[PDB]
Design a protein around this ligand. Structure first.
Ligand SMILES: *[C@H](C)[C@H]1/C(=C/c2[nH]c(/C=C3N=C(/C=C4\NC(=O)C(CC)=C4C)C(C)=C\3CCC(=O)O)c(CCC(=O)O)c2C)NC(=O)[C@@H]1C
Ligand SMILES: *[C@H](C)[C@H]1/C(=C/c2[nH]c(/C=C3N=C(/C=C4\NC(=O)C(CC)=C4C)C(C)=C\3CCC(=O)O)c(CCC(=O)O)c2C)NC(=O)[C@@H]1C
Ligand SMILES: *[C@H](C)[C@H]1/C(=C/c2[nH]c(/C=C3N=C(/C=C4\NC(=O)C(CC)=C4C)C(C)=C\3CCC(=O)O)c(CCC(=O)O)c2C)NC(=O)[C@@H]1C
Ligand SMILES: *[C@H](C)[C@H]1/C(=C/c2[nH]c(/C=C3N=C(/C=C4\NC(=O)C(CC)=C4C)C(C)=C\3CCC(=O)O)c(CCC(=O)O)c2C)NC(=O)[C@@H]1C
Ligand SMILES: *[C@H](C)[C@H]1/C(=C/c2[nH]c(/C=C3N=C(/C=C4\NC(=O)C(CC)=C4C)C(C)=C\3CCC(=O)O)c(CCC(=O)O)c2C)NC(=O)[C@@H]1C
Ligand SMILES: *[C@H](C)[C@H]1/C(=C/c2[nH]c(/C=C3N=C(/C=C4\NC(=O)C(CC)=C4C)C(C)=C\3CCC(=O)O)c(CCC(=O)O)c2C)NC(=O)[C@@H]1C
Ligand SMILES: *[C@H](C)[C@H]1/C(=C/c2[nH]c(/C=C3N=C(/C=C4\NC(=O)C(CC)=C4C)C(C)=C\3CCC(=O)O)c(CCC(=O)O)c2C)NC(=O)[C@@H]1C
Ligand SMILES: *[C@H](C)[C@H]1/C(=C/c2[nH]c(/C=C3N=C(/C=C4\NC(=O)C(CC)=C4C)C(C)=C\3CCC(=O)O)c(CCC(=O)O)c2C)NC(=O)[C@@H]1C
Ligand SMILES: *[C@H](C)[C@H]1/C(=C/c2[nH]c(/C=C3N=C(/C=C4\NC(=O)C(CC)=C4C)C(C)=C\3CCC(=O)O)c(CCC(=O)O)c2C)NC(=O)[C@@H]1C
Lengths: 162, 172, 172, 162, 172, 162
């Protein structure tokens, strides 16, 4: 998983050299933003259920057919609604991991890599998830740096889905 | 590789759980120690050459059989190769200190090192002694009270000692 | 690789003999079944995606421990990798059906696959179950009476089942 | 051994893809010509002895010295004549394999690859064999497709020797 | 690789000693035999083809099972490969004769050859017999009294026989 | 270790061919110069002590501080003087190996490769050694080919140090 720290090490290693001042400065920048990230992670965590359920309904509201047509890739039944909820729960949880890691690493390795093949194979629409993400961004109630941190990763995921 | 933060993340993910309040607080406390960690990396890095040479001197003084004719470290190319190994290990120890996780040191340096030395005929137990010598030299420089804001660096110094000890054990 | 024809040739050559009248007649009969063989390859090929996804669904429904956090197939990259393996195996099964010999499937796909999975930590017995699922899905499509000239496809269907079963056994 | 079927698979595999219609059509073409090939193989097989002996004499007739000068690479003695007969027998047998395989595969892997080194090392003249092959082409008594099939492989071998 | 001179040097260095008067005199005597050594390399080199073919003939005459259908050396590509091995080994024997040390033959040719043949299914004991055949052919040519200044070539002929015997043992 | 003989073999091997006349001629050239080399080696060997001690003093004489300042890399004490003597002894011994091998091989593999890292790590000055070498060149008392042989390797080392 890429984090500002592992990228600096990878760079120095790929060059067979010890870390430089620039790399040490990179660490300082990471450290200065860390707490805002940990605080945002805590906030989102304490509201996981509310945010997940609230986002699930949001998707069904903009895509009602997903609850009306029959199909494994739709949430017309209870089972599909659990699948959907679970999926939304994964997005949220992994976003808090990014906030903790100070980088997109968790999203890239746990959910983004291969997401196109997953959606194409099980016939899931990336627009459903894009919708759930937008909901989160408008209901986490964060503010200041904690807000800017959370949204930076929420937007990253969105762009990855469109 | 993992860094101190992603190590926790991976353990949480493999369980399907969010980080608990106490884990977030633990990471927060690690961030508070940040300056001490970066100073350690800066000081060892800035004194790398001296650390390797002084450790090399001590090693050859205690084990003269390594440098006399026929010794694994006899001849310029082998001595240079030995010096190079010392530096490689030190370099990777700084990476681990920088990230706060041993993974980079294990994966990219120590993994398979024992088997490699056995095939070449390099006395691993002597390499381990060299690593121990570098630890002593490096930690005195890291914990030098001069020219640095006062504080307790015990925990970071212990952690660094741990990376050196892991390196020594990997080939001894 | 060998195809149904060269397999016979190699056995004859390694003996320094011409093909006997009965062997030539056997090959001739294989040529007569040609259309059924090519239809099988066309039908599985044209329905590859559906065959892999439907088999994947069934597999994960019976073995939910593979997709829950910590499971070998948990996370997008591993799920995609697992889906990719399914397709790879299916692809090579079509090559074997096309040539009428298992060599291509053995040499370029199954050889060393068990050892590779063991090293990665992929549950081979679960892969085998996935392969079995693909067989069921693929053979229903192959033997579908609709839109195709009527006839007995028992022998070719049995042969294809054999390639799938060989694949499952190679990793189970 | 290359056959129309293995080449189609090799092509698709080298491209990491499933076989295409063009490749399926290739199989159809191969199947349509198969029987003419099997029938030609049977004919040549039933006349192996006659064709082999007849070709051996043909070579000696155009290259009489091979039966008059002394030398391991010549058939001045009984032994050399067996070697020669055996060699001619290999050419014929392997040509029937090509007819069965619907391709040059058998000739390329069993006899052609390395034939120059063999002839240069044991001092054998490729013209001797070219002669034996021509004999076969004019005495197999085939006709129609079976004839065109047989001769396509007999000419292939000839060109490989010149 | 080592040559006759550096072989002595390496043994002396690994001891931290200068070459003794008797060792210098021994090398000097080797230099005196120089022409005989170079003639041996020239004669085997200039007759390589004949040596390989005549040895190949003898080998197949005594072991006809190698060339009949199914035999390891049956078919043009395998026969050519077998002939090529013979030449490779001969080539490396000339290198060793030229340098006066077996190292080049061992390191670049014989090392791991037995294991390689076992995996391919090449009958090593038959290769060894082929090597022995090349020795006989090569040494008759080397020690031919015609067209060369008269002298005693016993020692160099013995040394060359030693390289051939080492080659045969490495795969038998 | 490179010698005229191993280089000829390496060349032929890199080309997958048997040695050529040119390579055989190379051997003749090597053989013709061998004895002068062995004789020079013997001479230097019988005077190792005198040459080594004499060179050590020479270095101290031109670089007196090496015996006056304190430091591990200096010979201000007995220990350092042994290190220094030992080092000079290595240069001499390895030069006789070159004379025996008819090439720079021994110097390249035993002392030259990595010498820059050694001197930089233990803070040794290449000029100290360059001095000791010059001393040897002016005190071995050789003459004729034996002299030209010895000096060719002594100069080689010198150039490697500057
Ligand atoms: C919700 C917004 C909508 C919905 C969802 C739905 N999803 C699935 C199935 C899968 N979802 C995933 C996604 C992930 N797996 C991962 O490991 C990760 C990273 C941690 C992600 C993002 C996967 C792999 C599957 C398939 C495997 C499985 O079943 O678990 C389904 C079921 C599809 C099926 O055919 O069985 C559904 C219904 N459906 C909706 O209608 C909502 C709008
Ligand atoms: C020094 C304290 C001791 C010593 C060392 C010595 N090492 C070698 C050779 C090698 N060392 C390595 C190790 C690494 N290479 C790497 O890239 C990494 C990072 C992943 C490590 C840890 C390797 C690969 C070699 C061999 C290849 C090479 O030489 O570069 C030698 C040389 C042995 C020889 O004969 O050539 C020596 C002498 N020797 C000692 O006596 C000390 C105890
Ligand atoms: C432990 C080895 C010893 C120790 C460390 C210590 N350091 C600080 C504070 C700082 N360290 C830095 C580091 C850098 N500044 C730079 O410009 C660079 C180069 C890129 C580095 C590595 C900084 C900026 C600070 C803070 C400002 C300052 O200099 O005071 C502390 C104090 C606390 C704290 O974390 O801030 C401590 C305790 N102190 C010791 O006594 C050990 C011997
Ligand atoms: C799916 C049903 C199951 C599953 C699969 C899974 N496989 C991998 C990784 C690899 N699979 C292969 C196999 C092949 N590669 C080939 O080129 C060929 C053709 C010759 C085959 C058969 C390989 C090489 C890998 C590793 C390299 C790679 O990832 O590309 C994984 C990933 C494991 C990881 O941690 O990275 C997975 C998950 N997993 C399951 O749970 C199912 C039972
Ligand atoms: C077995 C799986 C089922 C079955 C097969 C069957 N097929 C045929 C005949 C033909 N099949 C083809 C195939 C193709 N034509 C194409 O254009 C392509 C794309 C390149 C393909 C793959 C053709 C041309 C024929 C012959 C003409 C026709 O369509 O009838 C038969 C009849 C016999 C025979 O071999 O010719 C049979 C029995 N039949 C079944 O009932 C199984 C479910
Ligand atoms: C006949 C037209 C003339 C003739 C032939 C002759 N051939 C040989 C020896 C060999 N021939 C081969 C050829 C093959 N071996 C194979 O495996 C294959 C593919 C299946 C082929 C085509 C080989 C390998 C040999 C040498 C090994 C052996 O003896 O079997 C000889 C003997 C040469 C010798 O020196 O012993 C002869 C005489 N000679 C004639 O005069 C005819 C005109
Ligand atoms: C001949 C007397 C016997 C014989 C030989 C035979 N050898 C092979 C194949 C190989 N031989 C080698 C050996 C070397 N390759 C090298 O580069 C070197 C120098 C370091 C050596 C010593 C190798 C690598 C191969 C395999 C790769 C290749 O074919 O080039 C074969 C072919 C086996 C096959 O089935 O393909 C044969 C037949 N066979 C005999 O029966 C004789 C006793
Ligand atoms: C041992 C195999 C037999 C033998 C050898 C022998 N050779 C010589 C002398 C010479 N050999 C050469 C060699 C070459 N001259 C060349 O131009 C080339 C091509 C580059 C080569 C290889 C030379 C120049 C000589 C000296 C001049 C001459 O021809 O006399 C001797 C004599 C001694 C001595 O070393 O000089 C001997 C004994 N003699 C035998 O009877 C063995 C059968
Ligand atoms: C003498 C001219 C001056 C001098 C020398 C001095 N040298 C060292 C230490 C080392 N010298 C070497 C050199 C070699 N080692 C080799 O294996 C070879 C090839 C055979 C060579 C040329 C090495 C490796 C060392 C360090 C390891 C060791 O101690 O053996 C020292 C000691 C340096 C130290 O810090 O301990 C000294 C003093 N010093 C002078 O003042 C002279 C002018």
């Amino acid at each position: 998983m890429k984090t500002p720290l592992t990228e600096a090490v990878s760079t120095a290693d790929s060059q067979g050299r010890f870390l430089s001042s620039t790399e040490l400065q990179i660490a300082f920048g990471r450290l200065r933003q860390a707490n805002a990230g940990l605080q945002a992670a805590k906030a989102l965590t304490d509201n996981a259920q509310s945010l997940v359920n609230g986002a699930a309904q949001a998707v069904y509201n903009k895509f009602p057919y997903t609850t009306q047509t029959q199909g494994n890739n739709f949430a017309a039944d209870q089972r599909g609604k659990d699948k959907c909820a679970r999926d939304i729960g994964y997005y949220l949880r992994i976003v808090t991991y990014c906030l903790v890691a100070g980088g997109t690493g968790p999203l890239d390795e746990y959910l983004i890599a291969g997401i196109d093949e997953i959606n194409r194979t099980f016939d899931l629409s990336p627009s459903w998830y894009v919708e759930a993400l937008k909901y989160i961004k408008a209901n986490h109630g964060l503010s200041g740096d904690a807000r800017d941190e959370a949204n930076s990763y929420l937007d990253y995921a969105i762009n990855a889905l469109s | 590789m993992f860094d101190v933060f992603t190590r926790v993340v991976s353990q949480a993910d493999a369980r399907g759980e969010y980080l608990s309040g106490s884990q977030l607080d633990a990471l927060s406390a690690t961030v508070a120690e940040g300056n001490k960690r970066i100073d350690s990396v800066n000081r060892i890095t800035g004194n790398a050459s001296a650390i390797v040479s002084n450790a090399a001197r001590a090693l050859f003084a205690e084990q003269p059989q390594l440098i006399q004719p026929g010794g694994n470290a006899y001849t310029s190319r082998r001595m240079a190769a030995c010096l190079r190994d010392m530096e490689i290990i030190l370099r990777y120890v700084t990476y681990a200190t920088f990230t706060g996780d041993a993974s980079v040191l294990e994966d990219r340096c120590l993994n398979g090192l024992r088997e490699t030395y056995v095939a070449l005929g390099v006395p691993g137990a002597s390499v381990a002694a060299g690593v121990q010598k570098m630890k002593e030299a490096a930690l005195d420089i890291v914990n030098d009270p001069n020219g640095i804001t006062r504080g307790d660096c015990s925990a970071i110094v212990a952690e660094i000692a741990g990376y050196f000890d892991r390196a020594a054990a990997a080939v001894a």
